[PDB]
Symmetry: none
Subunit: 214 residues, 8 copies
């Protein structure tokens, strides 16, 4: 295996290593973690055209190189930030996603990827504009993140049924209900665009679609 063609499995492997550092007694949700981090590739198999990795989509590769770079940062931080890395960042993310994946499959069945397709966002980390009825953009628009995470339109019912690790919740919270003409919109847009990673954008996607319509 390799990270371009097996992103879930590759990253799962690294995160299984982290989860063991944290607690060898923690049951790593491996099935769900591979499935979740494979979602962007499922939706976009052209990321690896005709199966040759030599022609891999540049933006997709950059995202994976970002995850590699983040995994390096975690190894260094495990040393003197073990109790945050483990109990705020990594284990909550893994538990969260697995539960959220499981509820998506339960609510939407085996065709659940259909909920994610048809968005104008190609990459799981994209931040763009929500659209009006006709598909236009207006000043009533807000943030559309990942594969259909509409923060502008995000209801209180949806928000309160959402299970997100603290760090992702804190990133994305300020964007909920926010109009593009709001004084902090540029800042919040910029902050969410810069703060997302491949893995954490999936984590957000799963939380949203698990809870949507609550």
């Amino acid at each position: 295996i390799n990270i371009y063609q097996n992103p879930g499995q590759s990253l799962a492997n690294i995160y299984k290593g982290f989860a063991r550092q944290c607690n060898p007694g923690f049951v790593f949700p491996e099935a769900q973690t591979i499935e979740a981090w494979d979602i962007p590739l499922r939706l976009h198999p052209e990321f690896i055209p005709g199966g040759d990795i030599s022609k891999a989509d540049q933006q997709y590769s950059t995202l994976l190189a970002q995850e590699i770079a983040n995994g390096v940062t975690i190894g260094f931080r495990m040393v003197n930030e073990k109790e945050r890395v483990c109990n705020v960042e990594i284990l909550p993310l893994l538990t969260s996603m697995a539960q959220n994946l499981d509820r998506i499959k339960a609510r939407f069945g085996s065709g659940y990827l259909d909920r994610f397709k048809g968005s104008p966002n190609v990459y799981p980390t994209d931040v763009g504009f929500s659209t009006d009825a006709s598909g236009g953009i207006s000043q009533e628009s807000g943030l559309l993140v990942s594969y259909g995470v509409n923060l502008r339109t995000l209801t209180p019912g949806t928000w309160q049924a959402m299970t997100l690790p603290e760090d992702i919740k804190a990133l994305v919270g300020p964007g909920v209900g926010l109009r593009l003409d709001a004084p902090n919109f540029s800042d919040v847009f910029n902050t969410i665009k810069s703060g997302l990673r491949y893995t954490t954008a999936v984590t957000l996607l799963l939380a949203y679609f698990a809870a949507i319509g609550s």
Copy 2:
């Protein structure tokens, strides 16, 4: 004086040192530099409310600290990157601003600060959205940078009439003519927003209003 009630003078002094280090012969345009870097505070006296700096606008103060820190980085880079710091970065910026400020004062007159009013942007580094023909924001809108810099409507002619340092042009050029609904819009928005500093946003502001267009 201090950097908060006198940003133009304070920054001008730092940059005078950079210029003397680069080129002692180079005549430093002190009056223009001071007046240019005073523009956001003249536009926004609320930044220092009742004249007490301990209550100064936080975003404004942070903008100015970034300039102090960048100044320290510039002086560090003078050893191994003198060619680029001097002849690509600092001297072109100083000349550009003096020429564009004077041009602005010649073409619009002494009341030139009015041309900087009406924008959705409070801070000189702000990056927002231009309004379309209806007066709203739409997919046809684009980047509204600083105090009136409309990258969306920025013309071919205007682009090539603009006197502007290489790095600012490199930063901002991908945003020229760019619509909200462009696939790369988010990226280009992000880059420009992250790339601007107080001094360079004013440099861009002046180049645009001197060239339009």
Copy 3:
């Protein structure tokens, strides 16, 4: 349609009648007239909060009512004063505004409304004070009328380049170049403030911006 949400189309409809009563051959400049008299609502969409005409801005509504009432006086005056009403007041207005709008659109492009922003004036009949170099108001300031008509700095060359109906030129000329501390300033300010209407303020706005500057 109604005069609150559709001021340009409602005022155009009235003026189209007056122009027929004046000269049936006169080609009414409908598109420009509607676009010109909508400008104030275009600049301030909050005048009608959330599409609700009962919550319409009272000062905005009152300016429109005065145009309706003026319309009634115009129809009265057609009998004994047709020659002045038609040839001095109405037809030159309609023609000048259409020409000036078109010129403005040609000089400043589709985003021409921007040239109207940043003034201290909210209403098109507003009369406030010119700025000096400092950013402030002083004795060497003068009249700033409507959305950016700086009478203080308006030059002799610009005055005679402007296409403005007689009745508005005679109203506004006295304030050209006039300082706050001028002995006749208060009387001139009084005369301009009292004689301006919603439609004739827009007429002046377009004449000025067609003829400056840059």
Copy 4:
């Protein structure tokens, strides 16, 4: 392909389509109407080019063409200092207004419209002569007859006001409207229009008049 002698409309339309694009590339150029209008004189008078031999071209016709070329050279120089005035008072209003006038003529007379211009004593579009009584005689009641039937003597204040013309042209011709040949200034007016008109602008005046009359 074409030349100004055999193809005056296309040749002149091409030059003005040039001036219009440097002025404003957003400007929707009315190519069809401009070719047609500036062809009028040659359609009424094909003997200007006897049997398609441009070396036997009519003297007064060739001179009118050289004048237009010379005027185009003047315009090119004026575009350096006075670009705004030339574009937006001169060239663009002439084009839009002349197209509108031709369109109106065609909607109210069909393809048969050239018949309006027929059987004038004026051979050339720039000709300025005398209006005539019922029986075809000149009297002290005569005034100006310009181009292919533009009777200024007989032209009402009303019809004049109904005419859609650029400023340049209303200013030149207005003083002749209603003017008797025994008027103290008639000879000044005659002298000004004769020297002021050109092939191009005489057609502009023709189309404005026939679009308005009756």
Copy 5:
């Protein structure tokens, strides 16, 4: 009585402008002594222009400037009919007024020997357009425009430019070159626009405004 434009240029042109000033406003007080004195300045600086008092040996370039000026008086004559208000109140009376006030400031500051102020540029003719100098007599990339007898546009501050008393038409022509370096994108256009736009009389107007104000 026996004056000519070669030997008596100020008096010759004064006679013509006094006739314009009367066409304009018989109540305008013509500043005759100042106008004669100002327009003689180029000849007083360069007696050479007429070697030994022999006008048949007159300097070609000087003679060409005087012919330019005659040709311009002919066009003003023509423009008096259709553009009298612009001609009189923007172009002519302000020129005469400002020139007289500025010449008087200069005399009050320097006395009868004021002509020495105008010496020392490389420019032989009042309409000359050349380059600003460094401190070493050379031309560098920091040079800009140096026009007429020492009007250094490159080093003129916008403060003193705006303090200068000058006809609008002259401000608009010359303003673009204030502070402008020779490598600016528009320098070549500006250099050449001022070069083609200046005339014997308006260059002297500019010269006196500049020397009064600096």
Copy 6:
């Protein structure tokens, strides 16, 4: 096709018409004419932003309009001035350019366009100031026209090798070797600037680079 997106083809068509009028046996060098007159657009694709001619560069558009107006004049003048128009103005131009272009392609190869890059002139008709031997602009400088034609340094040997139509030769001749500080500089600068056209500037450019050395 149109003149904006297809200047070489639109212009070559018109001149092919003139040349057939001049001599139907004259072999019109069509590939070379089109190639030469597309040069400016190939150096500057931004002249037509994103392929949209409603957004065309205004200065570019103006040069092209001038060439169309000139074509109308050529058509008028063909009646009584056919000998000059053909044997002085048009045929030698087309002949000279095709030969110079072929030589330039042989000498600098397929990437020849890079020889026209990095001048301070954006438009083919631009007239600016050369850089001196030490790399600055000074009184030792002269005229820099189009995409690198240095009239100041133009040697006697280059001049006599140049194959140039006589109207272009008469225009540009006075600028050869002319210093910024010369008494008649400003006069010649003005004359050359006003007298150049899009097609004639391109003709000069190829004559120069075909003859240097």
Copy 7:
């Protein structure tokens, strides 16, 4: 050998200075290439000093400069006997060293066409002393000293002056003019000290020091 001082002033004077330097320290590496090139500068700027390659028509002022240079070499020969320490370590070797370094700086900065930097002052001779200019080509009371081929003392900064590599005696001669305005009470004295003190050879030393430092 088959050279002469009018056509080969650099090589000629270099030949004499190679001799002084060997007197000073046989172990001193004489910068011959830079020395010939530096002292050819005035002739390379004004080839009309020898019109048509004909020394019989040599410019009188040029020749006078060369005569003065010969006379100065004679006096150094005499002072070598009793003032060897100063002649060697204050006057000559520092001059030779400094010109070499300054010239290589100038050539690295501007390339082979460096000579263009030295043009366009109104000074024809390397020892000329004249007036700096305002921005309009004139002289005003803000003007000061303009020396040699563009050494603008009026405009020269006390800092960039300190940064110039220059032998003591030239530094002492020219320092008083730095920034000096023409209405200063010592201007006439300083103007004329510098004028009288300069030689072809030491004017070129000053020229290269300035143009190496000035940017």
Copy 8:
């Protein structure tokens, strides 16, 4: 200096010696000789890695040793072959290179070294295969020697314009226009490759680029 870091100066010094023996009055083109023989080093600074000549590129070092060994031979041959050595081999080589380098400087400008970049050949003595008109190597290709000397496309005009010493002309002549599939290709290729040396490959490179185009 040494031959590794300073190949131009070292070799010019040897050749200055030979020229001196040939004819003392022959002006040695010293600047051009040093510059030309530095070309291969300028293009490949990496030949001396981090300024350490003990790690100098072996092929490049061998090239220069060959030139030292050839110098010794020339010295030996000076006795019984001075005429040929001087008038055929040495004097024409130095004069040709100097003229050619000067022509290349005028033709291509100060960045002329850019003409020598992008070839497949690293060493000046390399012989490879040229690119055909469609951009590939094929049987239509031929000999590409040194930094861009394309013998395959080398025209009759370029051949006659080329200023080249007799021995190089005879070495290289049979390769001109020669195709890869020619029966004598192998022989000529082998001959050119074995017969070239550092100095002479540079002499050829310069002959060609100074003559291309004719």
